[PDB]
Symmetry: D2
Subunit: 261 residues, 4 copies
């Protein structure tokens, strides 16, 4: 149906995009970057993340496909050489949609902003020490002191979460995972020191203790927030949908990205 | 209805057990340790684990309650001082049952044994180096070399799993978590180096590479298995049921066991 | 001889400082904050670090003493209640000096700045991804990608180094320790993934790969450096000297700060 | 002078050994496996460790050389293809000896055994839970509960130590490093949770708390010790000497074994 293609913008990805557009022109496929139903991202995982955020208001109407023109990017299902086969399979249709969970971040001030993450949302201080009270379902759980906190989706667990020692979670699990960045632990300061995995409908709230200014990232996007009263995390009701044309199981995707390929 | 009480066996737990039996005698409660419907464990988490295994064939007919006579044992909901209040609340009934997921381990030979775990199942070598191929849903994922592997239930994630760097998982999540014990990683040997969290219906199979003898633990119970062809892990269809008389959320239980109490 | 006293500046530390100055006035002790031979820091480890940096040009002429007015600060040897005993012991003299190793950081541009650290020197990016080549004694060792790097002195190993998973090193060992902050490791990116401990006379050089702007911290002090060609680390030839009046072994100091007190 | 050659015993290593013996026969080199001055190990690091232990009573009279016939074994300096060049260089002599530190383990009973380690000494329980008091220079430092403890030499820090999260230490540093295996940490049980690095002349003593039977390994060799009163660790006064014919710096050796080669 209606589709669009985003490109990383180097010569290789732009040319692949032009060639796929020409192939789509041989079928009943209209290029429409306002209301696409298929969004193809040609590049790396950053390109894919940007495509997701370009269309985060129409996630229920869109299925995503990623082509990696660099290394195997984690959200990519296709190598450039297979682009023509993808054009054909997509043109016919009847593919199967797979959905991954997303993370909702709410930032309250003294007003309210919400963000959606496909990989993770992180919070750090705007310069001074980072100290927050971590409140789970209204239960005061710990006072965190350290460099920051990372809350990850299942598909994000192989990203920043992994570098911070988090568990890799299969994306059929509707959960979010909280990991610590360089927590201090001594006689007077104590944190849990393990990643925490939360189900859908649990709410994790971070509440400032002294400083109220924080640097909050959502996927690639980092923003300074001033005068914050609360940062709230929960599994979103929204999901991202992928078009799948063949089996590529998550654990094989993990194997291919981290073990050998 | 029918109940029984297991005790750690020290003077404090035996006397509490005798006093609770006397209190139950004032209600319509028959002591029956063949077909109980309520199993009370008085001791620590080891006592509770032994009670679970004493009745693992009647898990669908039983609700468990733990009293800790030492430190706050993780599966315990009651301190000894509250025993009389428990007798009363239990006598009336109408309490709410909560269920935690369990782990099924299958060991195949050259014959087949199955075990059920509430905390975890671990595998180590019987003396020589431990090397196994890890196969996930028939996908060859890694060759593990190291000291051993631990597969944990959600409620077990605060136990051995935690010491091995695993994530703590809320027990409403029907999953199991695989953690590494001292994996070797160099130019020639590679493992994933993160805990892995698996949903229900995924099967993780360990397949021997050289040595076929393994020491397999299920909760406290360690057994030498010889001539092993495969060890298979999956989330069990069986669940353990707890009798709950008041709110004691898992994350508060974690707070009280690890942060402060 | 000549001494001075720095204070954290709260009411408790200022009053202790005034009372110690009055006690010193009863001996042959001149207050001199230009050329002291004894520097007393009253506060926490931050106060002590600031005192060290206030006098880093006269380290060979100075012995430091720390009083902690908060929790046991790691560099502190005295509680406030013992201040009068310290005045007396110090007045007589004949105490023993103990020396800890220090870290030299050199930052080269396209010009050169040097810094001395008692705890550690860290490097992060000024916004974009952090990528540096790590060169040890002119040997290209790894390309580091992640959040940053921390180089610690022995006495700093219980500070930020510890939170990053580094080893605690006894300060009689003339060494520095490099730890990673959230390194990425996948099929294409590889780091050593262990802390590294370097002897005196080894030089660790960080060399930019793309971005040349870095945020470099030395103890509490964080500075944006632009147009960096190289950051070089080595154990300094300079040492910090403490006045010791009684045994307080490093491993007891560690026990008291992290295990119980 | 007098030399001997140990072989892993596969066809490749036995033939290399025979060919080197024939080459040595063309010089003033006597084969003597009672009092060698050069010990050549042909195989892997296990072969090298066995050669070290075969001659641990004559370490001051011996220089070791390792040839790896498998992967780059860490203690190996030569590939098989260079064997003839080694014969020649060794025949002439005038090579430089390099020394690495060693670890002394003393096991006291209710009698005394001492062992020397090139990689590490580990202690685990003989079946039950492992609990020991850790005493550093007669200072009670922690009660360790977990799977076991590993004490490593500098050259051993890239071995089991590395898998347990220890730091890699340059072998010019006369030290030993203690790492934890799966320590338990909760409200009631506390360990330091970081590797500890000890200088020469510090003594680390492990003292049993309940069970007195332990499985103690020294390099590859694992032994059940019963009725143990104390296990004591210290940097040995003895050193192992390597014959070096060219530069192969430790950090390049680490790079080649863990980063790429
Ligand atoms: C620009 N990034 C796009 C992405 C991605 C991604 N998504 C997954 C995925 N879901 N699964 C597996 N691989 C995944 N990638 C891979 O991550 C590498 C990213 N490049 S980078 O980190 O060097 N960089 C900052 C340039 C690259 O290989 C890419 O294919 C943002 C993301 O970086 C992540 N990030 C930030 N700081 C990090 C840290 N210190 N360690 C590890 N990740 C870190 C964070 O998650 C953010 O959303
Ligand atoms: C006899 N154990 C009973 C239990 C339990 C338990 N269950 C949870 C829970 N679900 N949540 C939180 N606390 C939990 N406990 C607490 O664990 C301490 C156990 N005593 S012990 O490990 O010292 N020991 C071996 C005497 C004690 O406080 C108890 O209340 C067996 C279990 O030990 C575990 N175990 C074995 N080796 C371990 C390692 N190296 N590190 C950590 N745990 C280890 C393994 O899980 C096994 O099933
Ligand atoms: C203001 N700091 C002074 C100090 C110190 C110190 N020196 C040692 C020592 N040698 N041994 C043991 N305790 C030590 N302290 C203790 O560290 C706590 C510091 N307060 S703080 O980190 O919360 N903060 C930023 C307000 C406090 O208890 C103090 O007594 C700077 C230092 O923070 C360190 N730092 C920065 N980020 C950190 C992270 N994420 N985790 C851990 N440390 C971190 C870094 O080393 C810097 O030099
Ligand atoms: C038979 N080993 C000989 C050796 C060695 C060695 N010495 C160093 C060195 N100094 N530097 C870098 N590489 C090093 N090797 C490499 O270690 C691999 C060993 N094979 S093995 O561990 O699979 N095995 C048990 C068959 C192999 O590549 C070899 O070249 C005993 C040693 O294994 C170590 N060991 C035991 N359990 C371990 C764990 N869980 N993780 C990691 N190491 C473990 C322990 O140190 C013991 O002394």
């Amino acid at each position: 149906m209606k589709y669009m293609i985003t490109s990383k913008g180097d010569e290789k990805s732009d040319l692949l995009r032009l060639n796929m557009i020409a192939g789509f022109g041989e079928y009943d496929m209209e290029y429409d970057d306002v209301e696409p139903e298929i969004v193809i991202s040609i590049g790396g995982d950053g390109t894919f993340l940007s495509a997701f955020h370009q269309y985060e208001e129409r996630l229920d109407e869109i299925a995503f496909i990623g082509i990696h023109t660099g290394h195997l990017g984690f959200y990519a299902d296709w190598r450039p050489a297979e682009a023509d086969k993808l054009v054909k399979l997509l043109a016919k249709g009847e593919y199967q949609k797979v959905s991954y969970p997303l993370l909702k971040t709410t930032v309250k001030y003294g007003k309210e902003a919400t963000y959606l993450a496909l990989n993770e949302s992180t919070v750090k201080s705007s310069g001074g020490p980072f100290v927050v009270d971590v409140v789970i379902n209204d239960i005061h759980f710990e006072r965190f002191r350290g460099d920051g906190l990372c809350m990850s989706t299942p598909s994000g667990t192989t990203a920043y979460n992994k570098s911070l020692g988090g568990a890799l979670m299969h994306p059929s699990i509707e959960a979010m995972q909280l990991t610590e960045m360089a927590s201090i632990n001594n006689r007077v300061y104590r944190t849990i020191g393990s990643p925490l995995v939360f189900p859908k409908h649990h709410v994790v709230s971070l509440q400032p203790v002294n400083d109220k200014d924080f640097q909050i990232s959502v996927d690639h996007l980092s923003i300074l927030h001033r005068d914050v009263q609360e940062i709230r995390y929960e599994v979103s009701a929204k999901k991202i949908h992928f078009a799948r044309f063949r089996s590529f199981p998550f654990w094989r995707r993990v194997h291919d990205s981290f073990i050998e390929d």
